[PDB]
Amino acid sequence: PLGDCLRDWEDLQQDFQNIQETHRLYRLKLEELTKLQNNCTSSITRQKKRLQELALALKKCKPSLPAEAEGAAQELENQMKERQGLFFDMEAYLPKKNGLYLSLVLGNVNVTLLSKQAKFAYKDEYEKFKLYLTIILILISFTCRFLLNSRVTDAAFNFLLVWYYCTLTIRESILINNGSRIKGWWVFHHYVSTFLSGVMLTWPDGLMYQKFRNQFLSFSMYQSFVQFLQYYYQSGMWRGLTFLLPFLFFGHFWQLFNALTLFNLAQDPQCKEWQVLMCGFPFLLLFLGNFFTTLRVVHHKFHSQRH
Amino acid sequence: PLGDCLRDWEDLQQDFQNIQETHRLYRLKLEELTKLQNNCTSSITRQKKRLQELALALKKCKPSLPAEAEGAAQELENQMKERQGLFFDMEAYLPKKNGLYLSLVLGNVNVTLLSKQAKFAYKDEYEKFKLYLTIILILISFTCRFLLNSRVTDAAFNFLLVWYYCTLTIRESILINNGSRIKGWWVFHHYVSTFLSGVMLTWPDGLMYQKFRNQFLSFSMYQSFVQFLQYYYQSGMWRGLTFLLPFLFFGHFWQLFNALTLFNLAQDPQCKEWQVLMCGFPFLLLFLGNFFTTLRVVHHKFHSQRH
């Protein structure tokens, strides 16, 4: 009849009463960590202030002073390295205030993961998502370049590209906030490629389009290729670059050649648009920045291998 | 000389030693909450299972049974309401697994705020951001519609729109995951408006453009207006709709009129594109869904006021 419902009801009564006891404990513990994070904020304060203070002290110690002062400054520098090391390792496990871009998108929400295992899991996903879409990019680009020629599909492709680049901005900005710091060219890169595909999204199907489309689609396929085989090197060290560097240089030069083709094509036919210049410029800037940063980084690693 | 540096160094030594003691305590407490959330998850399990079980029990009790069984089922339904109330109030303070869209963008990161004050602060920001951009939208749209007529600026405007709608998708999806549930038409709305501005981003500056542009820009200005004065009603209750409903209906009908203008304009001139149809359809679907949902909601509130 219904006595079974009555019995399971009676049981679940004290069950969820104990559950609510655990829940009160859990709420107390959530306010407890919150007040402990308030507390550590003072540790953050000392972290900045007294560090930078000893920094300026050593900075004012550079003048010529007795042997005692040079020896002391030596000891200070030999300790401050591990000092900042300790303090950064400390701060790494504290939820951090969002930056500017991530704030303007996600509002004011905390995203820090405060758990090394979580950081590894997150980066593994950040790589798998990159790979899967790099595959769908190669496929769609090649199909649009060979199997048919229709402006609608170029529009769809350029929309996929701008979406992909914006999503990578969001992802790698959480990653920057959360863990390692890749601050440098590899953000403006995405910022200058999305605007590129933008200004290419509005070509008025003239003749310049039928003279630039093939170069652009081939280059997109090949750049997607180098990103497709950039994953493997990240996963599995120095001997790897020995095969990657020729491909990276071939890519930089392919893109440089496209930029020149564009910046030149705007000089002979009956007319043109503004888009020829406004789309050739991104490419040149991409080449300059990318070549510059890659060579500087490989020189830094070469100099580290030197010593 | 340097003795001051030595003194402040000596002090900061035990200072940050105590800091590290607090830090060890804090780490222990973070693993403590983590294991407590593992625990409460069993509470989640019972929450789903035994609830739905008593649900199916009451469902099987609908048949005609003695007075004891109808009275008992009455007591069960009179308790289950507050039962689910308790259990949802409980679950509301548990970090939740991300959905589908937010997962495909932000990876696998937890965003729940687990603090009522945080929810209020977040929604207040979600409203202020909406307002500020609704202002910049009105301004730019009106300027593009009157002060000059140039296709570049229409492109910029449509890009601003698609960006804005995607950002609102992200924001309000974090909001859905975090607190109240607005599941319904007010997500596909943004999903069908971004694609609208998309398919309008690629008009080949024919004549159809010079016959549709004025209608579209006026309607954008007015829809931005109704969003600009939707904030105030949300902030400061039933007497408010008494003035808003005429504006909402005027807007729905303005958009219906644009959809008809488009779906018709594709029948007389020398030629057209596919964009006329692929852009008139969104508008019709917007009108249908929006009118439908608004009227259904106002009828629901009218029926709640009835009883």
Author numbering:
A (entry chain B), B (entry chain A): 8 to 243, 268 to 338
Authors' own words:
A recent study identified TMEM120A, also named TACAN, as an MSC that contributes to mechanosensitive currents in nociceptors. TMEM120A/B were originally identified as nuclear membrane localized protein that plays an important role in adipocyte differentiation. Here, we present the cryo-electron microscopy (cryo-EM) structures of both human TMEM120A and TMEM120B at overall resolutions of 3.7 Å and 4.0 Å, respectively. The cryo-EM maps of TMEM120A and TMEM120B reveal a shared homo-dimeric assembly, which is about 80 Å in height and 85 Å in width.
The transmembrane domain (TMD) of each protomer contains six transmembrane helices, designated H1—H6, enclosing a large solvent-accessible cytosol-facing cavity. The N-terminal cytosolic regions from both protomers together form the coiled coil domain (CCD), with each protomer contributing two horizontal helices C1 and C2. In addition, a short amphipathic helix H0 parallel to the inner membrane was identified between C2 and H1, flanked by two intracellular linkers L1 and L2. Near the extracellular side, Val159 and Phe166 on H2, Leu208 on H3, and Trp305 on H6 from the two protomers contribute to the interface interaction. An extra density was observed in the cavity, the size and shape of which is reminiscent of the 3′-phoshoadenosine group of acyl-CoA. Therefore, based on our experimental results, TMEM120A could mediate conducting currents in a bilayer system, but does not behave as an MSC in heterologous system.
